[PDB]
Symmetry: C2
């Protein structure tokens, strides 16, 4: 089976002591037994990573953590940018690449996302490679093909075993601020097509190991229907990740 | 007089262990008498800031520190981005805005830089507002005017009193990787024109308090000539900032 993953994208929220308080809310809210059945990760801003790392390692917590971006380069004259080497040294397990906010606000195209994914893997990090279509594509009925094409572009250059080392997240961007709602069936249709394409880019065996997460709006009342879907392996969670009790509840549901 | 400022832009270099080692080397290397004569700051990657804060505060160091960028927003759905609220809580004194590398690699324009400067000030941070012309402009002889227009655009929206709370850095981008070399006289020409413009944008009294740094190649061989100039108040240092002894040496020279 694929072990489900519930990863909380905090976005640009929470300072370093707020970070510690949130991680403690989660740790003290989620019964230990659940970790054998679900992987649970927090994804704080860069500036919170030291604080989270030392809490998680110092208290031997079973939650893992990650970052929200990284440079396609390893080091050098890139003022403002953060290397995957730094994230690795901090013990990060995951790094989000290609989030729709970065694609939109920061002009990140598929090729850059692919480069970031490769660099993540060079530093032993698991990239969470995000894809998803806008409402115009969805309305045209071309959402499956568009997602496949975006996946191919965002994984370009990766070898089959490298594909086996990524996570994919499907963001139904067409359901953000448009008033549209993505159903569990909508999620399953795309995540099934993702897995079929991964089987081509790698192998069926490898595609069957890759976690494909839902990255739309997740809460306690919809998470179970979504993660119950055959090809959906968890969630890249937005706003609910900032409420420790709520986030713990998502993890418990995804576990069983 | 204006007290000189030597600020070390680490760029995308040094993990959190290396950051600690470097700051301790700097503190070991720079005699305490020098801080009454020069202000010294380190500008690490985001992921090193907590580590640097705890060392500075716990060792009661006289060096200060800052970050290499920030969002124009305070919080929200900006995956990957870092808030000036976070930087303030980490005890940063400075934040670099509009570094040439961000203008070139990340498409930041003067208006974005001005918004970042304003947001830095809202969080009690001193923005280091970077400007500088590329080779084509220098080769045309229009460099002063180009810099003054960039300065005006990169400080747009700031009130006269807020201009008193910024630092300016002149980057001779035309001499960065081109084979051209900027002299101390070249720095003084632009820095004097920057101050003249600050006198117009703000007032002559405010302009005489604003630190204007040189942000080209600074090393132990040229720092004295640079800081000797009438309108140059220090350096935004690159690669020499990564060697604790060398960096301490720069500060010592800048101090007398």
């Amino acid at each position: 089976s694929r072990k489900p993953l519930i990863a909380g994208n905090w976005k640009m929220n929470l300072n370093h002591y707020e970070a510690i308080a949130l991680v403690q809310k989660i740790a003290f809210s989620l019964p230990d037994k659940y970790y054998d059945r679900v992987d649970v990760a927090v994804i704080p801003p860069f500036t919170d990573l030291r604080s989270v790392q030392t809490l998680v390692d110092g208290d031997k917590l079973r939650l893992t953590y990650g970052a929200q971006d990284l440079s396609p380069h390893d080091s050098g004259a890139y003022t403002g940018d953060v290397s995957g080497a730094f994230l690795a040294k901090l013990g990060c397990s995951y790094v989000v690449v290609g989030h729709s906010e970065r694609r939109t606000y920061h002009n990140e195209d598929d090729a850059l996302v692919a480069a970031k994914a490769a660099t993540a893997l060079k530093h032993g990090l698991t990239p969470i490679v995000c894809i998803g279509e806008h409402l115009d594509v969805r309305e045209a009925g071309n959402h499956v093909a568009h997602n496949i094409e975006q996946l191919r572009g965002s994984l370009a250059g990766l070898l089959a075993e490298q594909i086996g080392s990524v996570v994919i997240a499907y963001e139904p961007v067409w359901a953000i601020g448009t008033g549209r709602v993505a159903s569990a069936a909508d999620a399953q249709e795309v995540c099934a097509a993702i897995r079929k394409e991964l089987a081509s880019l790698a192998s069926p065996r490898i595609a069957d190991t890759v976690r494909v997460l839902y990255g739309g709006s997740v809460n306690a009342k919809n998470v179970g229907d979504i993660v119950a879907q055959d090809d959906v392996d968890g969630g890249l969670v937005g706003g609910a990740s900032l409420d420790g009790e709520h986030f713990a509840t998502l993890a418990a549901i995804a576990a069983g």
